[PDB]
Every structure is written in structure tokens, then in C-alpha cells.
Design an enzyme around this catalytic site. Structure first.
Site, PDB file in Angstrom:
ATOM      1  CB  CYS B  65      -0.971   0.001   1.184  1.00 26.23           C
ATOM      2  SG  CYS B  65      -1.876   1.536   1.328  1.00 26.23           S
ATOM      3  NE  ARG B  68       2.533   0.704   3.496  1.00 25.94           N
ATOM      4  CZ  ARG B  68       3.695   0.086   3.678  1.00 25.94           C
ATOM      5  NH1 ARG B  68       3.997  -0.403   4.876  1.00 25.94           N
ATOM      6  NH2 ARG B  68       4.569  -0.024   2.671  1.00 25.94           N
ATOM      7  CD1 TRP B 237      -7.227   8.751  -2.162  1.00 25.68           C
ATOM      8  CD2 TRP B 237      -8.218   9.240  -0.209  1.00 25.68           C
ATOM      9  NE1 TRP B 237      -6.273   9.295  -1.334  1.00 25.68           N
ATOM     10  CE2 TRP B 237      -6.855   9.605  -0.128  1.00 25.68           C
ATOM     11  CE3 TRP B 237      -9.046   9.458   0.906  1.00 25.68           C
ATOM     12  CZ2 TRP B 237      -6.298  10.171   1.020  1.00 25.68           C
ATOM     13  CZ3 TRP B 237      -8.491  10.026   2.046  1.00 25.68           C
ATOM     14  CH2 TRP B 237      -7.131  10.377   2.092  1.00 25.68           C
ATOM     15  CD  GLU B 242      -5.931   1.841  -6.729  1.00 26.50           C
ATOM     16  OE1 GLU B 242      -6.401   0.707  -6.470  1.00 26.50           O
ATOM     17  OE2 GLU B 242      -5.984   2.801  -5.932  1.00 26.50           O
TER      18      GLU B 242
HETATM   19  C1  HEM Z   1      -6.380   6.492   1.751  1.00 28.05           C
HETATM   20  C2  HEM Z   1      -6.248   6.162   0.460  1.00 28.05           C
HETATM   21  C3  HEM Z   1      -5.529   4.950  -0.009  1.00 28.05           C
HETATM   22  C4  HEM Z   1      -4.880   4.855  -1.200  1.00 28.05           C
HETATM   23  C5  HEM Z   1      -4.781   5.963  -2.228  1.00 28.05           C
HETATM   24  C6  HEM Z   1      -4.334   3.547  -1.283  1.00 28.05           C
HETATM   25  C7  HEM Z   1      -3.627   3.102  -2.399  1.00 28.05           C
HETATM   26  C8  HEM Z   1      -3.400   1.752  -2.589  1.00 28.05           C
HETATM   27  C9  HEM Z   1      -3.015   1.194  -3.831  1.00 28.05           C
HETATM   28  C10 HEM Z   1      -2.844   1.963  -5.119  1.00 28.05           C
HETATM   29  C11 HEM Z   1      -2.850  -0.134  -3.656  1.00 28.05           C
HETATM   30  C12 HEM Z   1      -2.435  -1.114  -4.734  1.00 28.05           C
HETATM   31  C13 HEM Z   1      -3.677  -1.773  -5.340  1.00 28.05           C
HETATM   32  C14 HEM Z   1      -3.353  -2.352  -6.688  1.00 28.05           C
HETATM   33  O1  HEM Z   1      -2.549  -1.808  -7.477  1.00 28.05           O
HETATM   34  O2  HEM Z   1      -3.908  -3.403  -7.029  1.00 28.05           O
HETATM   35  C15 HEM Z   1      -3.113  -0.415  -2.292  1.00 28.05           C
HETATM   36  C16 HEM Z   1      -2.981  -1.676  -1.768  1.00 28.05           C
HETATM   37  C17 HEM Z   1      -3.444  -1.925  -0.498  1.00 28.05           C
HETATM   38  N1  HEM Z   1      -3.954  -1.040   0.399  1.00 28.05           N
HETATM   39 FE1  HEM Z   1      -4.071   0.860   0.270  1.00 28.05          FE
HETATM   40  N2  HEM Z   1      -4.652   2.835  -0.187  1.00 28.05           N
HETATM   41  C18 HEM Z   1      -5.355   3.625   0.655  1.00 28.05           C
HETATM   42  C19 HEM Z   1      -5.944   3.309   1.891  1.00 28.05           C
HETATM   43  C20 HEM Z   1      -5.954   2.033   2.462  1.00 28.05           C
HETATM   44  C21 HEM Z   1      -6.667   1.622   3.613  1.00 28.05           C
HETATM   45  C22 HEM Z   1      -7.600   2.501   4.414  1.00 28.05           C
HETATM   46  C23 HEM Z   1      -6.349   0.285   3.868  1.00 28.05           C
HETATM   47  C24 HEM Z   1      -6.861  -0.577   4.966  1.00 28.05           C
HETATM   48  C25 HEM Z   1      -7.120  -0.146   6.212  1.00 28.05           C
HETATM   49  C26 HEM Z   1      -5.436  -0.122   2.828  1.00 28.05           C
HETATM   50  C27 HEM Z   1      -4.851  -1.371   2.703  1.00 28.05           C
HETATM   51  C28 HEM Z   1      -4.263  -1.785   1.497  1.00 28.05           C
HETATM   52  C29 HEM Z   1      -3.970  -3.212   1.257  1.00 28.05           C
HETATM   53  C30 HEM Z   1      -4.192  -4.384   2.187  1.00 28.05           C
HETATM   54  C31 HEM Z   1      -3.463  -3.306   0.015  1.00 28.05           C
HETATM   55  C32 HEM Z   1      -2.986  -4.586  -0.666  1.00 28.05           C
HETATM   56  C33 HEM Z   1      -4.115  -5.436  -1.281  1.00 28.05           C
HETATM   57  C34 HEM Z   1      -3.609  -6.746  -1.853  1.00 28.05           C
HETATM   58  O3  HEM Z   1      -2.517  -7.260  -1.504  1.00 28.05           O
HETATM   59  O4  HEM Z   1      -4.305  -7.347  -2.698  1.00 28.05           O
HETATM   60  N3  HEM Z   1      -5.205   0.978   2.025  1.00 28.05           N
HETATM   61  N4  HEM Z   1      -3.429   0.755  -1.628  1.00 28.05           N
HETATM   62  N1  LIG Z   2      -1.983  -4.262  -9.178  1.00 26.86           N
HETATM   63  C1  LIG Z   2      -1.558  -5.446  -9.314  1.00 26.86           C
HETATM   64  N2  LIG Z   2      -2.410  -6.489  -9.303  1.00 26.86           N
HETATM   65  C2  LIG Z   2      -3.776  -6.429  -9.420  1.00 26.86           C
HETATM   66  C3  LIG Z   2      -4.365  -7.105 -10.488  1.00 26.86           C
HETATM   67  C4  LIG Z   2      -5.750  -7.099 -10.655  1.00 26.86           C
HETATM   68  C5  LIG Z   2      -6.570  -6.431  -9.748  1.00 26.86           C
HETATM   69  C6  LIG Z   2      -6.018  -5.756  -8.660  1.00 26.86           C
HETATM   70  O1  LIG Z   2      -6.882  -5.106  -7.792  1.00 26.86           O
HETATM   71  C7  LIG Z   2      -6.523  -4.748  -6.449  1.00 26.86           C
HETATM   72  C8  LIG Z   2      -7.730  -4.422  -5.571  1.00 26.86           C
HETATM   73  O2  LIG Z   2      -8.121  -5.649  -4.974  1.00 26.86           O
HETATM   74  C9  LIG Z   2      -7.325  -3.455  -4.511  1.00 26.86           C
HETATM   75  C10 LIG Z   2      -6.784  -3.888  -3.306  1.00 26.86           C
HETATM   76  C11 LIG Z   2      -6.397  -2.966  -2.330  1.00 26.86           C
HETATM   77  C12 LIG Z   2      -6.522  -1.597  -2.570  1.00 26.86           C
HETATM   78  C13 LIG Z   2      -7.082  -1.139  -3.771  1.00 26.86           C
HETATM   79  N3  LIG Z   2      -7.218   0.191  -4.069  1.00 26.86           N
HETATM   80  C14 LIG Z   2      -7.543   1.154  -3.196  1.00 26.86           C
HETATM   81  N4  LIG Z   2      -7.275   2.377  -3.425  1.00 26.86           N
HETATM   82  C15 LIG Z   2      -8.232   0.757  -1.949  1.00 26.86           C
HETATM   83  C16 LIG Z   2      -9.241  -0.169  -1.671  1.00 26.86           C
HETATM   84  C17 LIG Z   2      -9.487  -0.182  -0.292  1.00 26.86           C
HETATM   85  C18 LIG Z   2      -8.688   0.674   0.481  1.00 26.86           C
HETATM   86  S1  LIG Z   2      -7.646   1.502  -0.554  1.00 26.86           S
HETATM   87  C19 LIG Z   2      -7.461  -2.082  -4.731  1.00 26.86           C
HETATM   88  C20 LIG Z   2      -4.619  -5.764  -8.504  1.00 26.86           C
HETATM   89  C21 LIG Z   2      -0.084  -5.668  -9.509  1.00 26.86           C
HETATM   90  C22 LIG Z   2       1.074  -4.973  -9.148  1.00 26.86           C
HETATM   91  C23 LIG Z   2       2.255  -5.596  -9.595  1.00 26.86           C
HETATM   92  C24 LIG Z   2       2.101  -6.775 -10.329  1.00 26.86           C
HETATM   93  S2  LIG Z   2       0.395  -7.056 -10.420  1.00 26.86           S
HETATM   94 CL   LIG Z   3     -10.097  -1.440  -8.081  1.00 28.36          CL
END
Ligand code: HEM
Ligand SMILES: N=C(Nc1cccc(OC[C@@H](O)c2cccc(NC(=N)c3cccs3)c2)c1)c1cccs1
Ligand SMILES: [Cl-]
Ligand code: HEM
Ligand SMILES: N=C(Nc1cccc(OC[C@@H](O)c2cccc(NC(=N)c3cccs3)c2)c1)c1cccs1
Ligand SMILES: [Cl-]
Lengths: 362, 362
Positions: B65, B68, B237, B242
């Protein structure tokens, strides 16, 4: 002990190399003679065929290289016969000429005598045979910051750059027995450069950007069957993003994005305008356009990734394990637009391969 | 045994959580009472304060993330009291309303009762509370391919989508004791959506693209001090990429780059024209522009990386080790334009954290 690890690497290499060449039968005797030459001398000497194939395998095993589809057509020049600094210089000059090939770049490697006792016979100081100098003093930044330390070392030896943003560094290398390296200015007739223009935006030439045609990495060690070729410069052609998204774009390099933004007529004031992204795209279009216009080989990142997918397919079909470094294989622009981004790669180290070695300056 | 690992995780969490809250003294007794409640009951119950801080730590420890920096301001809603499917539904509806906050998105998590014996009390099937359905049959592709399996599962339960490219999936979850999940259609008044327009290119609206305002991930497990909150939807947000570089751009998602190229008036015929890159930049500018115009929170990847650099600095200054997943932290466009690309991150797993769990469909 040394003989041991040498023997072990030799066995693994000779076996693999001879299967690939369809010469599986000759292995046992070849291996026998090697064990003999090792016990007597402490080392062994590669045949032309072994060395050529070893260099090709090393490229094939380079995890960070997207360009590996063409591994088997590497042009290998065996220069294990050089003994003098004139010969080394002329070999380097020749590599530049033949690799450049009037713009139709030939992937080439020149292989110098290997380390003997771990003692280098030839030590090349250049990172690439053709690269630009860099200066930094009094708030003044000129040329390529990545070259600052080597540039300073050259000027300690009596070289003096014109302090243009694109001074060609001299070739600089040291011979075994010599306390200091020697340097030789590059004949400009040998070095192709490409002025950067844009296909639609005429003002782009106001930036007066250029880059050199052929990147020839000259400070990595080629390791083949326990033999350490610390001096073995190799080249391919550029992938456009290396120039447009890094060499000209990085803040720690030429740092041109703000100037690009200005000439393409967009504001560089708000992150949300994505002006850096837009500037990157136009700068990268300009680089590809410019190289193609001049008839100098280059590849764009999409075509390169498509070629790399074929490399993956060929490895599979040949029964070879594929290794790769995802963090280096993805291009630095639009990486998610390539298949590479969407899978993973085993980053294991397989030999023969090319390795980093400590800089003798710094 | 179960009690053992539970005790161990509990010790590590309570110690860390109470130091951070400046309540170091209360640890010993708090720990004592926990060991007692564990021995008697096989489990223990988090205080509001412990649970709130645990959820914040879990976000802080989420390697992938980039967002953070704002971990400590997470809005935590404790719903461990829900017992009925009406209550769960209403809690989910409420989360959507309060998180959305008329467009000024509040990072929020709603925490449902935890697993008891490893037995789930509530099981949410949605990947995000708001997401679009996807269909595939007879060469026909409609909506979001990522949703095809969940969509098929919903229609097995009597739901029927309009087969628009943007059907809102129903909320779908199962209660302990129930053999099947239930589903509830989303009230449209709760769901903000944003039409995609471009700041300069008027034809961009011809693509009729839109996306939902608030991504609320609802299928990950929150783990805090040995307690497994398998149902704990959270939201932030969006970072613009994304939507613009993945959800709308991937060939396996909405696959819009060719259509983007056409409306922005460039050819999509030659890799060397970098039309995909150019289309990505314009689509991403459009997304940011559209969200800002409507007053819905969003962040661009440059600002987000700058915020993440501050998170790194804060971790250091607080004496906390930083963990990260470079492959997820770099943005999928212009990653080398961010500081993230140019350093490395320790990908170690630290708890509390959010984890994947198996889908009950598929
Ligand atoms: C406040 C605005 C936030 C932004 C802009 C943000 C941004 C992101 C982005 C861009 C990703 C990568 C998702 C992807 O490319 O697939 C991500 C992953 C993640 N974020 Fe954040 N995030 C935010 C808030 C949060 C919050 C509130 C939580 C939980 C309390 C959180 C937990 C995570 C987790 C667990 C992932 C990894 C998901 C996975 O492994 O599949 N984020 N975040
Ligand atoms: N981005 C990647 N994988 C991927 C592929 C398909 C869907 C996907 O959705 C993540 C989706 O489940 C998800 C999970 C956690 C956060 C978000 N986006 C947000 N802004 C938030 C959702 C909730 C709090 S923040 C969105 C992620 C990769 C990076 C490098 C190699 S592959
Ligand atoms: Cl999404
Ligand atoms: C034919 C055209 C070639 C192209 C387009 C190509 C492309 C690339 C690119 C883009 C990189 C990443 C460099 C960076 O981002 O910093 C790379 C790395 C590399 N390539 Fe290739 N390459 C080609 C040929 C070759 C040849 C002929 C060799 C050697 C025989 C080679 C060996 C390597 C090695 C060792 C690296 C990694 C360098 C390091 O770790 O620092 N490549 N290649
Ligand atoms: N690209 C990265 N690092 C980096 C940083 C500064 C300079 C640099 O130059 C590589 C330069 O030494 C080099 C090395 C090997 C190949 C090339 N490029 C070429 N086309 C060839 C040269 C010789 C044969 S092909 C260029 C690479 C990173 C990726 C992910 C995180 S950082
Ligand atoms: Cl380079």
C-alpha cells in the site's frame, strides 16, 4: 581448492555446452583432457567453439535482459591473443566499428585474455566504451552525472574535457604490470550520434538533445566454466526507454522533463496534469523517431516485450528453465501494457553469466 | 496448541499496541487477564481501543500500500455486535454512506465478529462492496471480466443483471448456520459514480466510460493479536492509475486503449508511435480531471508517492522498521518518475496485517 571449484564449474559447463552443440559423445574425453590440463597447470583454455557458445549462454542467462531472444546470434570476437595496450586499443576501436555497422547494429562481444591467478591481464575502466563525461563543481552541473567519478579520474591522468554536455570520455584501461591506466581519445568518425527531434513538434530540436548510437558495456565480468573474463565488452542496440525514460529523464541524469514540457507547450505546475507522464511519452516518441530516421537500430519497449515473450516460449519448447528479474524486465514506462508486468520470474543465478565487478576508480 | 499460537500473537500485539498508546504500564495486568481469559475460554476479546489501534497497525504494515501515510486517521467502526443478516446489510450500507461522505472520502473500516473456532460468523462474498458485474458467453463480453465468476454465482442465486457494462453487483454474504448466502441490491442513492470526461478533448465523452467513487475491499482477513476478523471491509480513495492504467486499460479488464487512441485522434497501428503510452496518459488525465470536477477524492501517483516518502520518513523518525513490496508500490505508469522505483524495500510480513482468504465461490 581453487582447482576444485574450477573443475566443478568446468564439468557443468562442458557437459551443458556440448549437449547444446549436439556433441554429447565428445564430452568424456574433452572432460578428461580438461582435468589433466587443470592438474598440471592450475587452469584450462577454452576452444573457440566453447568460448563462443559460453558467451551466448551467458547472455541467455542474464535475468535482467529483455533482449535475450537473439542470444544465439551474438557475434563473438576472440581476442585472447592481445598482449599490448596498442592491441587492446585497436581491438576496442574495431569492436566499435564492427558493432556499429553503419547503424545496422550487430550484437557483438570482444573477449580479452581471462584472469590468470585472479590476476587481471587487462582492466577496462569505462562503464561503456562510448559514454559522456560529467562535471560538478561550484553549483555547476555539466554533462552526465553518472560519469562524474570516472571523468574526475580521467582528468587526474591528463585528459581534459571541453565541458560540453556531451564530451566523449576517452577509452581508459590498465595493463597487467602497469601501475596506471592509459587513455586514448575516441576518433569521432567511429562514434555515431543521433540528434533528438520530434515527428510533429518542430521546436523539440531547441533542446539540442542527442545520444550515442551504440551502448557497449565494458565493465562486467563474463564467467564461463570457471574462467573469469573480466574484460569482455559487449553491445546490443538500445531499447528506446533507456534513453528517453532514464538517461535523459532521471533527475540524477540529464533531468530534461521540465524542458520537454515547455517545448511541447504544456504547464509543469500540477502533479494532477500528469505533465511528467506526457513529457515522458513525447520524449520517448522523439527518441524512437530520431534513431529510425537516421537508420540506427533501436527497439521500442512493446516490440521488445513481444520478442521477450518469444524467448520465454523458446525456453519452454527447448526444455530450458527460464530465469528473470521482474524489476529490471518491466519497462520504466507503461509497464502494465506489457505481458511481463502480469507474470512472475524466477530470479535464480545460472552460469555462464555476466557479473558486476568493483570499479578501480572510486 | 491453538491456545499457544493465540497466546504468542496476543503477547506480541498487546505489548506493541500499549507502548504506542503510551500505556506501557498497563501491559502486565492486561496480559495477565488475557492469559486467564484464554485458558478459560480458548479465546479473548479486544477492547475498542485495542481493536481500533490494531486495524490502524494492520494498514501501517500493508507492504503493497502506497497510501499508508494516513494510517493513524483510519475511521474504525466496531460492529462485533451484529447477529442478523439485516444488521450486516445495514452495516454495509452504512459503511458505504459514511465512507463516501458526499465525495470527501473517509478512510473507514467496519469490523464484524471474528472467527470463533476458525468458524466464520459472517462471510462476505464481494471482492469490493461496490463493483461491476461481468458476463462472458457466445463470444460476447459485457462488463468487468474480473467479476465473471462472482456474477455467475449471484445469478445462480436468483439475481439477474441488466447486462450493461456497469451493472452494480448486489451485496452478497453468508451467515454462520446458513447453507447459502443472501444478496441485496445496492440502493443507487448510496453509490457515487463518476462519468469520465477529458479536460481538453470533448469527444472523450463518446466512450461513455465511468467508474465508482469508493473502492471498499471486502474479502480480506484482518488479523490482530491472534484474532481473525475474516469480515472487515475497508476503504480509502483511489489512486488514479488504478482506474486509468488498469481497470479501464488492461486487456483482461475493460480494454479501452484502442478506443481511447481513436477519440484522441491518433493511429493505433505502430508500436513505435507509442500510441498505447499516449492513450494511457490521456485516459489517466481524464480520470483525475473527472473525479476532481465532481468533488470526489482521488490522488495522482506522483502526489501519492510524495506522501509515501513522508511515510518512510515518519517510520524512521519513530524508530519503526519499514516494510514494502516494490512490485506493488511502483505505479503502473511513469514508475521511474517516482522515488519508489529508485530504492528497495524489505518485503517481510509484520502483524497486525490484512491477508488473502479463499473465495467461497470458485
Ligand atoms: C487512503 C487512500 C488509499 C490509497 C490511495 C491507497 C492506495 C493503494 C493502492 C494503489 C494499492 C495497490 C492496489 C493495486 O494496485 O492493485 C493499495 C494496496 C493496499 N492497500 Fe491501500 N490505499 C489507501 C488506503 C488504504 C486503507 C484505508 C487500507 C486498509 C485499512 C489499505 C490497505 C491496502 C492493502 C491491504 C493493500 C494490498 C491489497 C492486496 O494485496 O491485494 N489501504 N493501496
Ligand atoms: N496491481 C496489481 N495487481 C492487481 C491485479 C488485478 C486487480 C487488482 O486489484 C486490487 C484491488 O483488490 C485493490 C486492493 C487494495 C486496494 C485497492 N485500491 C484502493 N485504493 C483501496 C481499496 C481499499 C482501500 S484503498 C485495490 C490488482 C499488480 C502490481 C504488480 C504486479 S500485479
Ligand atoms: Cl479497483
Ligand atoms: C540486442 C539488443 C539488446 C537489447 C535491446 C537489450 C536490452 C536490455 C535492457 C533494456 C537492459 C536493462 C538495462 C537497464 O534498464 O538498465 C538489459 C540488461 C542487460 N543486458 Fe541486454 N539487451 C540487448 C543485448 C544484450 C547483449 C548482446 C548482452 C550481452 C551479450 C546483454 C546482456 C545484458 C545484461 C548483462 C544486462 C544486465 C546489466 C546489469 O545487471 O547491470 N544484452 N538489456
Ligand atoms: N535500470 C535500472 N537501473 C539502472 C540505473 C542507472 C543506470 C543503469 O544503466 C544500465 C547500463 O549499465 C546497461 C546495462 C546493460 C544493458 C544496457 N542497455 C543495452 N541496451 C545494452 C548494453 C549492452 C548490451 S545491450 C545498459 C541502470 C533499474 C531497473 C529497476 C530498478 S533500477
Ligand atoms: Cl545506457
Amino acid at each position: 581448492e581453487e582447482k576444485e571449484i574450477l573443475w566443478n564449474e568446468a564439468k557443468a559447463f562442458i557437459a551443458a555446452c556440448y549437449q547444446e552443440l549436439g556433441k554429447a559423445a565428445e564430452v568424456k574425453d574433452r572432460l578428461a583432457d580438461i582435468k589433466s590440463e587443470i592438474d598440471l597447470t592450475g587452469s584450462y583454455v577454452h576452444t573457440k567453439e566453447e568460448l563462443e557458445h559460453g558467451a551466448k549462454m551467458a547472455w541467455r542467462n542474464s535475468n535482467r535482459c529483455i533482449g535475450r531472444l537473439f542470444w544465439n546470434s551474438l557475434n563473438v570476437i576472440d581476442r585472447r591473443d592481445v598482449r599490448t595496450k596498442e592491441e587492446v586499443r585497436d581491438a576496442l576501436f574495431h569492436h566499435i566499428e564492427t558493432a556499429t555497422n553503419n547503424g545496422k547494429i550487430r550484437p557483438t562481444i570482444t573477449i580479452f585474455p581471462p584472469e590468470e591467478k585472479g590476476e587481471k591481464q587487462v582492466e577496462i575502466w569505462n562503464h561503456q566504451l562510448i559514454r559522456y563525461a560529467g562535471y560538478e563543481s561550484d553549483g555547476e552541473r555539466i554533462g552526465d552525472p553518472a560519469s562524474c567519478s570516472l571523468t574526475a579520474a580521467c582528468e587526474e591522468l591528463g585528459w581534459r574535457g571541453e565541458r560540453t554536455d556531451f564530451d566523449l570520455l576517452p577509452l581508459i584501461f590498465r595493463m597487467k604490470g602497469d601501475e596506471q591506466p592509459v587513455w586514448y581519445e575516441l576518433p569521432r568518425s567511429l562514434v555515431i550520434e543521433v540528434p533528438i527531434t520530434h515527428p510533429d513538434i518542430e521546436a523539440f530540436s531547441d533542446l539540442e538533445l542527442k545520444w550515442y548510437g551504440v551502448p557497449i558495456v565494458s565493465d562486467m565480468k563474463l564467467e564461463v566454466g570457471g574462467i573469469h573474463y573480466n574484460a569482455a565488452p559487449f553491445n546490443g542496440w538500445y531499447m528506446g526507454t533507456e534513453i528517453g525514460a532514464r538517461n535523459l529523464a532521471d533527475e540524477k541524469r540529464y533531468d530534461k522533463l521540465k524542458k520537454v514540457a515547455s517545448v511541447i507547450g504544456i504547464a509543469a505546475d500540477y502533479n494532477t496534469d500528469l505533465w511528467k507522464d506526457q513529457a515522458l511519452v513525447e520524449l520517448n516518441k522523439a527518441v524512437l523517431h530520431s534513431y529510425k530516421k537516421q537508420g540506427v537500430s533501436i527497439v521500442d519497449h512493446h516490440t521488445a516485450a513481444s520478442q521477450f515473450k518469444r524467448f520465454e516460449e523458446q525456453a519452454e519448447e527447448a526444455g530450458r528453465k527460464l530465469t528473470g528479474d521482474w524489476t529490471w524486465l518491466i519497462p520504466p514506462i507503461s509497464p502494465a501494457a506489457t505481458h511481463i508486468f502480469h507474470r512472475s520470474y524466477d530470479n535464480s543465478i545460472v552460469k555462464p553469466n555476466y557479473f558486476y565487478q568493483d570499479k578501480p576508480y572510486e
